[PDB]
Design an enzyme around this catalytic site. Structure first.
Site, PDB file in Angstrom:
ATOM      1  N   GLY B  11       0.814  -1.196   0.000  1.00  0.00           N
ATOM      2  CA  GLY B  11       0.000   0.000   0.000  1.00  0.00           C
ATOM      3  C   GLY B  11       0.851   1.251   0.000  1.00  0.00           C
ATOM      4  O   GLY B  11       2.080   1.195   0.070  1.00  0.00           O
ATOM      5  N   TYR B  13      -0.891   8.445   6.327  1.00  0.00           N
ATOM      6  CA  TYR B  13       0.254   7.613   6.676  1.00  0.00           C
ATOM      7  C   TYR B  13       1.130   7.357   5.455  1.00  0.00           C
ATOM      8  O   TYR B  13       0.712   7.588   4.321  1.00  0.00           O
ATOM      9  CB  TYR B  13      -0.208   6.286   7.285  1.00  0.00           C
ATOM     10  CG  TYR B  13      -1.140   5.485   6.402  1.00  0.00           C
ATOM     11  CD1 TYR B  13      -2.509   5.717   6.409  1.00  0.00           C
ATOM     12  CD2 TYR B  13      -0.650   4.489   5.567  1.00  0.00           C
ATOM     13  CE1 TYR B  13      -3.363   4.986   5.605  1.00  0.00           C
ATOM     14  CE2 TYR B  13      -1.495   3.752   4.760  1.00  0.00           C
ATOM     15  CZ  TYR B  13      -2.851   4.004   4.782  1.00  0.00           C
ATOM     16  OH  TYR B  13      -3.696   3.273   3.980  1.00  0.00           O
ATOM     17  N   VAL B  15       4.004   4.916   3.080  1.00  0.00           N
ATOM     18  CA  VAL B  15       3.924   3.651   2.362  1.00  0.00           C
ATOM     19  C   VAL B  15       4.111   2.491   3.331  1.00  0.00           C
ATOM     20  O   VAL B  15       4.914   2.564   4.272  1.00  0.00           O
ATOM     21  CB  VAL B  15       4.965   3.609   1.232  1.00  0.00           C
ATOM     22  CG1 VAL B  15       4.507   4.461   0.060  1.00  0.00           C
ATOM     23  CG2 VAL B  15       6.314   4.090   1.738  1.00  0.00           C
ATOM     24  N   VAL B  16       3.363   1.415   3.105  1.00  0.00           N
ATOM     25  CA  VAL B  16       3.402   0.225   3.945  1.00  0.00           C
ATOM     26  C   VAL B  16       3.851  -0.953   3.092  1.00  0.00           C
ATOM     27  O   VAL B  16       3.387  -1.126   1.960  1.00  0.00           O
ATOM     28  CB  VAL B  16       2.031  -0.051   4.601  1.00  0.00           C
ATOM     29  CG1 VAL B  16       0.916   0.050   3.574  1.00  0.00           C
ATOM     30  CG2 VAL B  16       2.018  -1.414   5.277  1.00  0.00           C
ATOM     31  N   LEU B  79      -1.560  -9.323   7.746  1.00  0.00           N
ATOM     32  CA  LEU B  79      -2.801  -9.988   7.386  1.00  0.00           C
ATOM     33  C   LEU B  79      -2.917 -10.065   5.869  1.00  0.00           C
ATOM     34  O   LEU B  79      -2.366  -9.234   5.143  1.00  0.00           O
ATOM     35  CB  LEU B  79      -4.006  -9.261   7.982  1.00  0.00           C
ATOM     36  CG  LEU B  79      -4.213  -9.516   9.477  1.00  0.00           C
ATOM     37  CD1 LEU B  79      -3.621  -8.387  10.303  1.00  0.00           C
ATOM     38  CD2 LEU B  79      -5.686  -9.706   9.800  1.00  0.00           C
ATOM     39  N   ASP B 123     -12.404   5.854  12.096  1.00  0.00           N
ATOM     40  CA  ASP B 123     -11.974   5.567  10.731  1.00  0.00           C
ATOM     41  C   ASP B 123     -12.329   4.129  10.372  1.00  0.00           C
ATOM     42  O   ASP B 123     -11.538   3.395   9.779  1.00  0.00           O
ATOM     43  CB  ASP B 123     -10.479   5.823  10.561  1.00  0.00           C
ATOM     44  CG  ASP B 123     -10.108   6.187   9.137  1.00  0.00           C
ATOM     45  OD1 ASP B 123     -10.908   5.903   8.222  1.00  0.00           O
ATOM     46  OD2 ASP B 123      -9.016   6.758   8.933  1.00  0.00           O
ATOM     47  N   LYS B 125     -13.800   1.546   8.219  1.00  0.00           N
ATOM     48  CA  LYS B 125     -14.195   1.341   6.833  1.00  0.00           C
ATOM     49  C   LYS B 125     -13.545   0.055   6.343  1.00  0.00           C
ATOM     50  O   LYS B 125     -12.560  -0.405   6.931  1.00  0.00           O
ATOM     51  CB  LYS B 125     -13.788   2.536   5.955  1.00  0.00           C
ATOM     52  CG  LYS B 125     -12.296   2.797   5.891  1.00  0.00           C
ATOM     53  CD  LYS B 125     -11.988   3.937   4.934  1.00  0.00           C
ATOM     54  CE  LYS B 125     -10.564   4.435   5.104  1.00  0.00           C
ATOM     55  NZ  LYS B 125     -10.388   5.801   4.541  1.00  0.00           N
TER      56      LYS B 125
END
EC number: 2.7.11.22
Lengths: 11, 285, 255
Positions: B11, B13, B15-16, B79, B123, B125
């Site tokens: 992804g 905040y 970058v993950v 996950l 948040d 969603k």
């Protein structure tokens, strides 16, 4: 009067 | 970071990434924040300070924080995917009802753990609900979360409570429940319940679906900053049309979870005791 | 979830409690210096319209940081500024910019120094910025107050804010204990009512359990006008707080 230099008052 | 090998970028905040620990061998999420004029962001600060206080099975467990001078690393459990991707993939056919019930049960357990503490998600969603292959859903993306030990003053749009739309002052826990309720509908109809385009379009969609809020249903609507007398006098839609596949117990739970009054809106602890959850299992996705 | 929230707060205030008597181990700064720092923090919080909870969190961060670290004379104000910045980031909707804090420090510490000391404070606290304060317990106590008297809450907030000035003798009392003592003192001062039975059951703090803290707070309140640091009294000399600071403290507490 939030603008203070507390170093002078500490001594 | 020297002991973490970035396997992929999942992804953006900051970058993950999905990475691996060279010592333990487990796969983790390695979200990074570029610490520049402002220093550590308020979102990251709140996320680290609150997610580390929440140790629940139905909550993404932040387990390591590599806080260096130039970058801030948050290490969460990895996950498989989020609920948004799972719903998009399973769009041809509806998600199985036992799986929906299990997911809602776990989400409400996580929300009840958050509300027993003083953490407000705000948040909630499908993009923030992560899913593992063991059929467990977990709350994530606590960057927008606030601690409501003292009342939290108001500052996506689809999952915003009607109270926030009508100029609410203090955030309540119900704003989370409403969001969960919307996700509930999005898990049953494969469609966003209130896909609003603007802050007034979303309000009109909510009013069309659940009826315009009269003072009898929600005492105090008139004396609200963002409420206008020029609001259409819609009628509440029957929940059979709103959620066809949902049963009587599910429809009642959704009706209690989408209550206009923030005070009278059901809580996660009270929702966990609903008769809808009398046959909860743990199916795999 | 309210009772569970209060139980979690009671459990967490012990973990976030600063070391008692950390000023003894400090080789350069003293209790008076911390009182001056809290005075200036109150003045800054009123200057930037920050919340009381923000100042309480900042004071807690300073106490914990100085418990776990040694700070010289010059860097005490930098530590206080970084704690205020962290508290504003955590609690306030829009934290004041780092340049604003640098300006409010009379251009003593640069932006880089403020950010570096913020990083140091965050590392020392290990990002545990969710410490329960006096305000968090006082709000729950107000939820069990009948009738809802605005002056009671304002005076309880004033007493709790005063308790942030002197570490000695206020770091030996739990934040729940200080909040209960402040609520009882305010209730007796303006309404002449004692510690309610509802809070006796909810918290377990009987009136005799807060007696040391209650007497300490009464002594501070009586000597509040004569205190060297007067930022809080001026702050509570406003119509926003009903001017509770101008009220006369009771001479004798009937215990």
């Amino acid at each position: 009067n939030a603008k203070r230099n507390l170093s002078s008052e500490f001594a | 970071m020297e002991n973490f090998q970035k396997v992929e970028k999942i992804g953006e905040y900051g970058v993950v990434y999905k990475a691996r620990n060279k010592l333990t061998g487990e796969v983790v999420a390695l979200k990074k924040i570029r610490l520049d004029t402002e220093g550590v962001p308020s979102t990251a600060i709140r996320e680290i300070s609150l997610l580390k206080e929440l140790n629940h099975p139905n909550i993404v467990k932040l387990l390591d924080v590599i806080h260096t001078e130039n970058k801030l690393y948050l290490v969460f459990e990895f996950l498989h995917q989020d609920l948004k991707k799972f719903m998009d993939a399973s769009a041809l056919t509806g998600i199985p009802l036992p799986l929906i019930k299990s997911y809602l049960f776990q989400l409400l357990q996580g929300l009840a753990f958050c509300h027993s503490h003083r953490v407000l998600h705000r948040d909630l969603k499908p993009q923030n609900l992560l899913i593992n292959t063991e059929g467990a859903i977990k709350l994530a993306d606590f960057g927008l979360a606030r601690a409501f030990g003292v009342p939290v003053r108001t500052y996506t749009l689809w999952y915003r409570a009607p109270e926030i739309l009508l100029g609410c002052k203090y955030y309540s826990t119900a704003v989370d429940i409403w969001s969960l309720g919307c996700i509930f509908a999005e898990m049953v109809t494969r469609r966003a319940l209130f896909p609003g385009d603007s802050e007034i379009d979303q309000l009109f969609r909510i009013f069309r679906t659940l009826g315009t809020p009269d003072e009898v249903v929600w005492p105090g609507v008139t004396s609200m900053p963002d409420y206008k007398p020029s609001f259409p006098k819609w009628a509440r839609q029957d929940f059979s049309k709103v959620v066809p596949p949902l049963d009587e117990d599910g429809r009642s739970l959704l009706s209690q979870m989408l209550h206009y009054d923030p005070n009278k809106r059901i809580s996660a602890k009270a929702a966990l005791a609903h008769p809808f959850f009398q046959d909860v299992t743990k199916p795999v996705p | 979830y309210h009772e569970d929230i209060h139980t979690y707060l009671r459990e967490m205030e012990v973990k976030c409690k600063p070391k008692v008597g950390y000023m003894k181990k400090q080789p350069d700064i003293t209790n008076s210096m911390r009182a001056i720092l809290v005075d200036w923090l109150v003045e800054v919080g009123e200057e930037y319209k920050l919340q009381n909870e923000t100042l309480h969190l900042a004071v807690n961060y300073i106490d914990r940081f100085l418990s776990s670290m040694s700070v010289l004379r010059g860097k005490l104000q930098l530590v206080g500024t970084a704690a205020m910045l962290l508290a504003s980031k955590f609690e306030e909707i829009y934290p004041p910019e780092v340049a604003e804090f640098v300006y409010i420090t009379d251009d003593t510490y640069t932006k880089k120094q403020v950010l570096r000391m913020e990083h140091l404070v965050l590392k020392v606290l290990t990002f545990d910025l969710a410490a329960p304060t006096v305000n968090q317990f006082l709000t729950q106590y107000f939820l069990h107050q009948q009738p809802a008297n605005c002056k009671v809450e304002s005076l309880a907030m004033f007493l709790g804010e005063l308790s942030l000035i002197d570490a000695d003798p206020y770091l030996k009392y739990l934040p729940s204990v200080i909040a209960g003592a402040a609520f009882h003192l305010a209730l007796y001062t303006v309404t002449g009512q004692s510690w309610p039975e509802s809070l006796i059951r909810k918290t377990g703090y009987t009136l005799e359990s807060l007696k040391p803290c209650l007497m300490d707070l009464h002594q501070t309140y009586l000597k509040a006008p004569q205190h060297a640091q007067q930022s809080i009294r001026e702050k509570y000399k406003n119509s926003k707080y009903h001017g509770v600071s101008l009220l006369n403290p009771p001479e004798t507490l009937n215990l």
